[PDB]
Amino acid sequence: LQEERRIHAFAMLAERQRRMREAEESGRRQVEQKRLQQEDMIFKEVIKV
Amino acid sequence: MQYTGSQYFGEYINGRMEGSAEYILPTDTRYIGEMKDGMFHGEGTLFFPSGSRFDAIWKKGLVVKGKYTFNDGLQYEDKHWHYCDSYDRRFYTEICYGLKPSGISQLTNMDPPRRIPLGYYDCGDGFYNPTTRVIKDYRNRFLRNADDDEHEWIVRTCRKGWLPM
Amino acid sequence: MSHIQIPPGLTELLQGYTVEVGQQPPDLVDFAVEYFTRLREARRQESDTFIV
Amino acid sequence: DLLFCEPTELYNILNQVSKLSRLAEPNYLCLLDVRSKRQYDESHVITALRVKKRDHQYLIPESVDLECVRYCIVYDSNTPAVEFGQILIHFTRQPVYVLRGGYECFSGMYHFFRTQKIIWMPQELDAFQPYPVEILPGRVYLGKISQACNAKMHKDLKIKAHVNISMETTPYFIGNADKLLHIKLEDSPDTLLFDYFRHICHFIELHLRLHSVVLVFSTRGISRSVAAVVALLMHYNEETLKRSWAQVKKCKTNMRPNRAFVAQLLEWEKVLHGEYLTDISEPIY
Amino acid sequence: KNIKWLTHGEFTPEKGRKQIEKFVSTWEFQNRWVYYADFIEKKDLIHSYHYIYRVRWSAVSANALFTIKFNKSKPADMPVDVSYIFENSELLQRPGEIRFREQWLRDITETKHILLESIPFKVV
């Protein structure tokens, strides 16, 4: 049990590491997507002119 | 068994266990394993309480292995891990499918699309507000609370349930 | 706003197009591609000389 | 016999120290989260077992001599804990204490206590290393020099102030004259810290107005800092010596000045009040 | 290649979506750029409807628009009239034409980048 549980702990730390990576990516993505959207609006206005 | 909760399905000799077997540990972890002298002596896979798989090879009753895979089946590296990172910021499903088969707004970690309900944040397990220092679980109950270091990490790094701008 | 200016050359290409349009071609999409192929030799050289 | 205990006390006791971590003896502590396994997986208190529930009965975790485990604690997320508080009233030689704000503020003020690691083995518990101690609630901390240097401890409280009476150098805020307070002398009784207390108190107070986060140390959490806390409390509340001393006594039970420092504090009291209101003839000083 | 089309009544809007998506799936050559489609309003016309879908790509983005006509005054068995447009282009392309160039998708996205470089920062 001693060995298993310490293994389990380090594994759960790695699980946290992944969860962090995915949460950060989601944060990045929201901003990037919405700025790209308004940049595309600006682009299309320029196109229309 | 009883006194910690361990469980085994296999063969017994002298009353101590010697087996090729599936197995349960009072983590409520599941395992598949071989035994000698009443000890694990096997190449065996450990299936988490969260289903995911760790692997364990046994030398004289100690472990010597590396493999992991998530409960979704994402293959993982504990080192160098090349995933959703400098080579490509795509999640497991987005790398496997590419563009998710119909482009539902699950071109993001969880959807169909909604605001985070309470306020708070997404960090995948739980909702957390920097204005409350509380984490919550996706049943909107509760999770471990956090002062400044973790609060500041959440504040910079992840996605709040701000109003959808 | 990023403004624009009128160089020559384009005008002459449009002029050629309108003149062949003066034929009133059918087959328009390929007829126009073929017209640019005809330009590729003949009308490009002519335009280059025509400017003065 | 069920009682309310502030989370600051939890942070005092669960990282209480006396050479050892008190966590390396079980009769010191028990703490038993009745709630879901899944919360416990996501984390728990720094020796807190996972309760087993069975057909809505609780299966007694006799992990320890429940009869006499001298401090005896329960938390839900907020304040099914209450009935566990009731049942416990039969048990311990001491009364039984509930953790006011079972999780939300206690770790919201101090995240680090959360962890996915369940037990800490006796070597691992004994190997534990204390976070700094809290004097003025949420606002001023007490520490020993190797804590004050410890990078994680310093960073995690988002700290930048030092307050110390000692000769011995420390790694940060060097020459930052407004976010460092440092005084130099031995814990020798002729160190006339009486005057320096006024400066110390005003500096801490200013960080209160600034809401700066402040650590106090006298190398070993020993003595000079203790007297400075007596002065700070007496001037901050216009309290008697005996009140400040009683608070200090729990703040970290090793804390103690010296008899010339006691005389200096007695003059500090007589200056603030105009007279001695506490009598030093008891041994409790 | 192209897909083949229902009749005015055999059509339903969801069938229209699926048909258009499958048409875009018949696009191939740069189709490492993957498509997904968006639903767009019905336009109501005296003896006719139009109904509309957008298509978007991700791999800057490429996008396409498809148009469908519906005959209030002629049979449900009337084969549907369909046409589609690229956001840059005036060209009312029709499924039976010689197929588009995916190269235009490359061209469009490049031009978008070029205007990104162009930007007059008359920004609020």
Swiss-Prot record, chain A:
Transmembrane segments: none annotated. It comes from the Eukaryota. It is found in: Cytoplasm; Mitochondrion; Cytoplasm, Cytoskeleton, Cilium axoneme. The gene is Cfap91. Phosphorylated by PKA. Part of a complex containing MYCBP, AKAP1 and PRKAR2B. Interacts with MYCBP and AKAP1. Interacts with CFAP61. Expressed in the testis, in cells involved in spermatogenesis. It comes from Mus musculus (Mouse). This is Cilia- and flagella-associated protein 91. Involved in sperm flagellum axonemal organization and function. May regulate cilium motility through its role in the assembly of the axonemal radial spokes. The chain holds residues 589 to 637 of 783 of the full protein. Belongs to the CFAP91 family.
UniProtKB/Swiss-Prot annotation, chain B:
Its main location: other. InterPro entries: MORN, Morn5. One of its GO terms (cellular component) is sperm flagellum. The keyword Repeat applies. SUPFAM superfamilies: Histone H3 K4-specific methyltransferase SET7/9 N-terminal domain. Keywords: Cell projection, Cilium, Flagellum, Repeat. Pfam families: MORN (PF02493). MORN repeats lie at residues 8-30, 31-53, 54-75. It is found in: Cell projection, Cilium, Flagellum. It comes from the Eukaryota. Only detected in testis (at protein level). This is MORN repeat-containing protein 5.
Curated annotation (Swiss-Prot), chain C:
It comes from the Eukaryota. Four types of regulatory chains are found: I-alpha, I-beta, II-alpha, and II-beta. Their expression varies among tissues and is in some cases constitutive and in others inducible. The modification N-acetylserine is found at S2. It is found in: Cytoplasm; Cell membrane. The modification Phosphoserine is found at S47. Transmembrane segments: none annotated. Phosphorylated by the activated catalytic chain. Belongs to the cAMP-dependent kinase regulatory chain family. Regulatory subunit of the cAMP-dependent protein kinases involved in cAMP signaling in cells. Type II regulatory chains mediate membrane association by binding to anchoring proteins, including the MAP2 kinase. The inactive form of the enzyme is composed of two regulatory chains and two catalytic chains. Activation by cAMP produces two active catalytic monomers and a regulatory dimer that binds four cAMP molecules. Interacts with AKAP4. Interacts with CBFA2T3. Interacts with the phosphorylated form of PJA2. Interacts with MYRIP. This interaction may link PKA to components of the exocytosis machinery, thus facilitating exocytosis, including insulin release. This is cAMP-dependent protein kinase type II-alpha regulatory subunit. It comes from Mus musculus. The gene is Prkar2a. The chain holds residues 1 to 52 of 401 of the full protein.
